[PDB]
Scaffold this active site. Sequence first.
Site, mmCIF file in Angstrom:
data_model
loop_
_atom_site.group_PDB
_atom_site.id
_atom_site.type_symbol
_atom_site.label_atom_id
_atom_site.label_comp_id
_atom_site.label_asym_id
_atom_site.label_seq_id
_atom_site.Cartn_x
_atom_site.Cartn_y
_atom_site.Cartn_z
ATOM 1 N N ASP A 87 0.860 -1.181 0.000
ATOM 2 C CA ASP A 87 0.000 0.000 0.000
ATOM 3 C C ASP A 87 0.884 1.213 0.000
ATOM 4 O OD1 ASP A 87 0.605 -0.965 2.740
ATOM 5 O OD2 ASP A 87 -0.175 0.997 3.325
ATOM 6 N N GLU A 150 -1.902 -0.154 6.597
ATOM 7 C CA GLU A 150 -1.017 0.719 7.347
ATOM 8 C C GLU A 150 -1.362 0.735 8.828
ATOM 9 O OE1 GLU A 150 -3.167 5.045 6.744
ATOM 10 O OE2 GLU A 150 -1.578 4.404 5.371
#
Length: 433
Positions: A87, A150
């Site tokens: 990501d 995250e």
Amino acid sequence: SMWKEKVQQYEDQIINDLKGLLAIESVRDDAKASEDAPVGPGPRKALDYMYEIAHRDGFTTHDVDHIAGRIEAGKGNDVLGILCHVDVVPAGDGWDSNPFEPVVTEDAIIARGTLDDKGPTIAAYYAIKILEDMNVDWKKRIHMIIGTDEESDWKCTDRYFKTEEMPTLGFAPDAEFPCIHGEKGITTFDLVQNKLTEDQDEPDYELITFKSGERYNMVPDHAEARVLVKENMTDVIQDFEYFLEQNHLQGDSTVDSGILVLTVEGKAVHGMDPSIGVNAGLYLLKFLASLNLDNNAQAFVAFSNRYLFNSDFGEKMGMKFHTDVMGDVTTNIGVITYDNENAGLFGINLAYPEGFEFEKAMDRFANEIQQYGFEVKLGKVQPPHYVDKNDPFVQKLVTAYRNQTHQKNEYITKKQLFNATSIYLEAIYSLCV
């Protein structure tokens, strides 16, 4: 080095693979998430992209709820983990280029995720592919663990590690508490006896004092008991010697004025593996167990024998726990004291691997103990954890390095990239081959 040329032969394939991964707008999108793409379509594609090239190149992979997964290589008990992520943050403010259309320049390649993380992720994977092309003979498994969320920090608590194997060592540059084996967990606590100020007949033996060990996580190699002998002493002395030889122990007995002093030598060794040494204190209590003692001294000797004697691996405390690689729960009894006024005390050092159920076990035992007039006083808890600078792989990385050598418009240098592969390459080689 030789490493560096080696990579240079893979320059175009590294670039191509990298470009492919940078081209995916793998940005978080919580509002469009689903069970198929728990952080949104982008990251899901970037993770899938990695599995494809893995397959194309013959590696087995394993997905975890389409949020994280691994590419597997190597052979053996140990598993080296390299944790990265695919990501990326949004581009946003004033890019002189299209952040998700990578531009490869003379010296450099420009895109979001070039630095964090897509570049290093590709470097790592190619070190592994290169080694695999060598048809090299592995001695360790390698898990390239790839995340998308995250919000997680790679805790043994987080989605991947709930069910997947814990690396026995590895590299996880952006996490402070990754689920990688490292430091054994460790605690201390005292088992304290409740004094019994009641009334009783004169005893054959009254234990006046006992001392063994000190407040270190070491196995005590000295113990002393001072005992008031009602009737004669030749029997107790004779039995002590017999006990010393039956147990292959050095020890000795001294009398003066009605007080017998019993001394036992052991074998000091670090408390992190007590099976290797001999606990003078526990042995001396083991012998006292055969005597008619005063009540408090007898309950104290008895407690040592039920829970402590001959239990280096927590067995008698209900805490035996074995780990396939990371070791066993271990109990060292570092300090044992006893006197008339305070009664008795045992200082315990308990070492554990991830993830033994620590407080659950304590509570159980804490209660079992109640009935004997013993309480638990909790010391410091130092949970198992990974220490980057102690890690044998992180270290080979620093050595391999030494041997070689959210912004806008983010980019990575071609040379930065290939070097990163060379260094991963060297380190992984030295360590897994």
